[PDB]
Symmetry: C3
Subunit: 136 residues, 3 copies
């Protein structure tokens, strides 16, 4: 508690991603690992879900993750694991097609499945874990 190295622990916060609607940080950097909170397809300015259903929500959620990554000195190539929570399993393929446009190489490990309900009636919510570079 004093006998080992003191590791970085930094709260990541950017107005380019939505404000919190509960007692949480957008992301936490600890040592070099970044835990990103689950992101809905929420407009950063209004705090409400973007219109147009699951495809548009997925694009916005991933955009939000990208801005949090950038605030933490990373990009999508630093992501090592993601979780995609769906309101409808039948949206699996369509959300995958959005996802692949952001995660273009060194693809993260992943789980994707249908939950009973998301906050605000979201159709998709995406969590991620990243590691600060350099990565060989």
């Amino acid at each position: 508690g004093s006998h080992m190295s003191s590791l970085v622990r930094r709260i990541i916060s950017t107005a380019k991603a939505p404000a919190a609607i509960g007692p949480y940080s957008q992301a936490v950097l600890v040592d070099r690992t970044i835990y990103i909170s689950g992101q809905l397809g929420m407009d950063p300015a209004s705090g409400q879900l973007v219109p147009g259903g699951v495809v548009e929500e997925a694009k916005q959620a991933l955009t939000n993750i990208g801005e949090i990554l950038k605030a933490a000195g990373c990009d999508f190539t630093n992501v090592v694991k993601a979780t995609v929570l769906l309101a409808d399993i039948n949206d699996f393929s369509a959300v995958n097609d959005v996802y692949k446009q952001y995660f273009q190489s060194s693809f993260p490990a992943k789980a994707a499945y249908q939950v009973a309900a998301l906050p605000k009636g979201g159709r998709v919510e995406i969590e991620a874990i990243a590691v600060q570079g350099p990565l060989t």
Copy 2:
């Protein structure tokens, strides 16, 4: 498998948290990272859910997490990521109000959402990841 440092890996076990009802440890410390098993609002002495519904269950689950943290040389300030699994999304705000009483600063990254069912008919289950200090 012998050419790198041998990292600490320690099973965390305290009678101040409930006994296992399956093949799992309360938590695992590996290097400085602590993975805590999902905690229901179970009374540590009886192994049954405390009465009074989701608010009381959330308080008990977080109390249980606190005792596991303490057994691992940590407190709630060491938590970096939590997951709150709900039986009912409409309980989001009320569980947040309990949660904020324990996680009072450096708030963890978080995801919270409704699943189809929890063991024992629990109304809430909370998982967490912590990192042993010092943290700067």
Copy 3:
């Protein structure tokens, strides 16, 4: 981004586990931590769920995880955290009985609960996190 050590980041890929059905890697090794994608009870050769329901699916999912671990220089003793996603909470005990045959000591931290639906109509999906040895 150049001022710290360059950590290993390696995509784990083995034909002894099923091919991807989306934009993801079977596992990612980053430093010494291995994030394994969620595994259904899919036959590695055919890419379809094995017959016989949840018990047989759980055995196949864990077999698949074991082959991914082996490709990453690990075995089941390196696992520190697992998540068991069920189509039916009433299968909790039966899946635990399969799980315990693979995870025989130093049991991982765990969460297990029922989701609304899994890809392909799977009855069980298992994710895991491991750390490369040596572990003391």
